[PDB]
Amino acid sequence: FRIGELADKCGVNKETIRYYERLGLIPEPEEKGYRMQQTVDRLHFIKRMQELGFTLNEIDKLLGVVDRDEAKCRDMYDFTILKIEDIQRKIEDLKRIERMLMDLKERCPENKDIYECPIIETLMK
């Protein structure tokens, strides 16, 4: 149904890497070529998974599994849980950085109009 300049209606710029990577299907040759609906859907799915924090690699694996299995709902459920747990790990890492920044900033004296900043000194060593 669509031509790829169209179908970039999924909010993706004209993307050969996706089918180059097997994620997206190959288009079919119409009046010669060249057109891509279930691909529209697969591309929505992929775009949103990426907005949900799945890497392209993860999406590659996931799609292989769901495509080849009988219980697709179960697969997808499982991967979504693994994703929740991944996001939680990222969150914790950011919290660890926040805490570091906090300790750094708490190093500063009452009078901060000085050349010597314990933050800079600390990060310099």
Which residues of the shown chain bind its own copies in the complex (CB under 8 A)? 41-42, 44-45, 48-49, 51-53, 66, 70-77, 80-81, 83-84, 87-88, 90-91, 94-95, 97-98, 100-102, 104-105, 108-109, 112-120, 123-125
In this complex, which beta carbon is closest to its own copies, that of residue 21 or of residue 122? Answer: 122
95 touches, from its own copies, Hg ion, none (C-beta below 5 to 8 Å by class): its own copies
DSSP codes of every residue in the chain: ---SSSSGGGS--S-HHHHHTTSS-PPB------B--HHHHHHHHHHHHHHTT--HHHHHHHHHHHHH-S-HHHHHHHHHHHHHHHHHHHHHHHHHHHHHHHHHHHTS-S---SS--HHHHHHH-
Among 12, 63, 65, 117, binds Hg ion (CB under 5 A): 117
CB of 1 to its own copies, least distance (A): 16
CB of 72 to Hg ion, least distance (A): 7
Q: State yes or no: residue 84 binds Hg ion (CB under 5 A).
A: no
In this complex, which beta carbon is closest to Hg ion, that of residue 37 or of residue 115? Answer: 115
Question: Which residues in the chain are immediately followed by a break of C to N over 2.5 Å?
Answer: 30, 36
